[PDB]
Design a protein around this motif. Structure first.
Motif, PDB file in Angstrom:
ATOM      1  N   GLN A  21     -11.331  -3.819  16.348  1.00  0.00           N
ATOM      2  CA  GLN A  21     -10.309  -4.325  15.461  1.00  0.00           C
ATOM      3  C   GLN A  21     -10.943  -4.899  14.203  1.00  0.00           C
ATOM      4  N   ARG A  22     -10.127  -5.123  13.191  1.00  0.00           N
ATOM      5  CA  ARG A  22     -10.625  -5.604  11.913  1.00  0.00           C
ATOM      6  C   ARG A  22      -9.967  -6.924  11.545  1.00  0.00           C
ATOM      7  N   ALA A  23      -9.523  -7.662  12.554  1.00  0.00           N
ATOM      8  CA  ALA A  23      -8.898  -8.957  12.325  1.00  0.00           C
ATOM      9  C   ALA A  23      -9.974  -9.987  12.014  1.00  0.00           C
ATOM     10  N   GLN A  24     -10.799 -10.272  13.006  1.00  0.00           N
ATOM     11  CA  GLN A  24     -11.982 -11.094  12.810  1.00  0.00           C
ATOM     12  C   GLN A  24     -13.218 -10.220  12.965  1.00  0.00           C
ATOM     13  N   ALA A  25     -12.987  -8.906  12.920  1.00  0.00           N
ATOM     14  CA  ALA A  25     -14.028  -7.907  13.144  1.00  0.00           C
ATOM     15  C   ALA A  25     -14.580  -8.039  14.556  1.00  0.00           C
ATOM     16  N   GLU A  26     -13.786  -7.615  15.522  1.00  0.00           N
ATOM     17  CA  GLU A  26     -14.112  -7.831  16.915  1.00  0.00           C
ATOM     18  C   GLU A  26     -13.989  -6.556  17.745  1.00  0.00           C
ATOM     19  N   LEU A  27     -14.879  -6.421  18.719  1.00  0.00           N
ATOM     20  CA  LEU A  27     -14.806  -5.345  19.693  1.00  0.00           C
ATOM     21  C   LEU A  27     -14.124  -5.860  20.955  1.00  0.00           C
ATOM     22  N   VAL A  28     -12.839  -5.591  21.074  1.00  0.00           N
ATOM     23  CA  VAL A  28     -12.056  -6.102  22.184  1.00  0.00           C
ATOM     24  C   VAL A  28     -12.370  -5.352  23.474  1.00  0.00           C
ATOM     25  N   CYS A  29     -12.772  -6.093  24.491  1.00  0.00           N
ATOM     26  CA  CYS A  29     -12.941  -5.535  25.818  1.00  0.00           C
ATOM     27  C   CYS A  29     -11.569  -5.387  26.456  1.00  0.00           C
ATOM     28  N   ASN A  30     -11.027  -4.178  26.392  1.00  0.00           N
ATOM     29  CA  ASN A  30      -9.643  -3.921  26.760  1.00  0.00           C
ATOM     30  C   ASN A  30      -9.464  -3.881  28.276  1.00  0.00           C
ATOM     31  N   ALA A  31      -9.923  -4.936  28.925  1.00  0.00           N
ATOM     32  CA  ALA A  31      -9.768  -5.117  30.358  1.00  0.00           C
ATOM     33  C   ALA A  31     -10.056  -6.564  30.723  1.00  0.00           C
ATOM     34  N   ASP A  32     -11.062  -7.127  30.063  1.00  0.00           N
ATOM     35  CA  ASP A  32     -11.471  -8.505  30.306  1.00  0.00           C
ATOM     36  C   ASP A  32     -10.786  -9.455  29.329  1.00  0.00           C
ATOM     37  N   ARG A  33     -10.105  -8.882  28.337  1.00  0.00           N
ATOM     38  CA  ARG A  33      -9.462  -9.656  27.276  1.00  0.00           C
ATOM     39  C   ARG A  33     -10.499 -10.430  26.469  1.00  0.00           C
ATOM     40  N   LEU A  34     -11.667  -9.826  26.308  1.00  0.00           N
ATOM     41  CA  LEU A  34     -12.734 -10.424  25.521  1.00  0.00           C
ATOM     42  C   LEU A  34     -12.860  -9.695  24.196  1.00  0.00           C
ATOM     43  N   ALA A  35     -13.659 -10.233  23.297  1.00  0.00           N
ATOM     44  CA  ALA A  35     -13.859  -9.616  21.998  1.00  0.00           C
ATOM     45  C   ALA A  35     -15.207 -10.009  21.407  1.00  0.00           C
ATOM     46  N   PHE A  36     -16.103  -9.037  21.303  1.00  0.00           N
ATOM     47  CA  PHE A  36     -17.418  -9.264  20.717  1.00  0.00           C
ATOM     48  C   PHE A  36     -17.320  -9.241  19.195  1.00  0.00           C
ATOM     49  N   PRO A  37     -17.695 -10.338  18.534  1.00  0.00           N
ATOM     50  CA  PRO A  37     -17.558 -10.461  17.087  1.00  0.00           C
ATOM     51  C   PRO A  37     -18.668  -9.755  16.318  1.00  0.00           C
ATOM     52  N   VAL A  38     -18.278  -8.991  15.312  1.00  0.00           N
ATOM     53  CA  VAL A  38     -19.232  -8.348  14.431  1.00  0.00           C
ATOM     54  C   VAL A  38     -19.477  -9.240  13.220  1.00  0.00           C
ATOM     55  N   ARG A  39     -20.607  -9.924  13.216  1.00  0.00           N
ATOM     56  CA  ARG A  39     -20.924 -10.871  12.161  1.00  0.00           C
ATOM     57  C   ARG A  39     -21.542 -10.138  10.981  1.00  0.00           C
ATOM     58  N   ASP A  40     -20.683  -9.423  10.255  1.00  0.00           N
ATOM     59  CA  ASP A  40     -21.077  -8.628   9.091  1.00  0.00           C
ATOM     60  C   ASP A  40     -22.281  -7.744   9.405  1.00  0.00           C
ATOM     61  N   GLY A  41     -22.022  -6.651  10.106  1.00  0.00           N
ATOM     62  CA  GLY A  41     -23.076  -5.723  10.451  1.00  0.00           C
ATOM     63  C   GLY A  41     -23.645  -5.968  11.832  1.00  0.00           C
ATOM     64  N   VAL A  42     -23.880  -7.234  12.165  1.00  0.00           N
ATOM     65  CA  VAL A  42     -24.514  -7.585  13.427  1.00  0.00           C
ATOM     66  C   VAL A  42     -23.474  -7.981  14.475  1.00  0.00           C
TER      67      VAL A  42
END
Length: 70
Positions: A21-42
């Motif tokens: 997603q591009r809300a806070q730039a997050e990779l949502v784990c669509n099962a655990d309801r988690l979201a890994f944040p992309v800190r501008d590239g990283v």
């Protein structure tokens, strides 16, 4: 055999495909309801330092009348 796929990153725990997603730039784990944040590239693939959909990150920088200038 020739592989195509658009599947680059899956959850290291649930092995479910991440939802970018591009809300806070997050990779949502669509099962655990988690979201890994992309800190501008990283991307932060660390669950403890990531964000959840159940647990947001409380950030309020010092609500205080602090003396400044000198």
């Amino acid at each position: 055999m020739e592989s195509r796929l658009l599947d680059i990153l899956v959850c290291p725990v649930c092995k479910g495909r991440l939802e970018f997603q591009r809300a806070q730039a997050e990779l949502v784990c669509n099962a655990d309801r988690l979201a890994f944040p992309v800190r501008d590239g990283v991307p932060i693939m660390l669950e403890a330092e990531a964000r959840s959909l159940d647990a947001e990150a409380p950030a309020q920088p010092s609500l205080e009348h602090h003396h400044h200038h000198h």
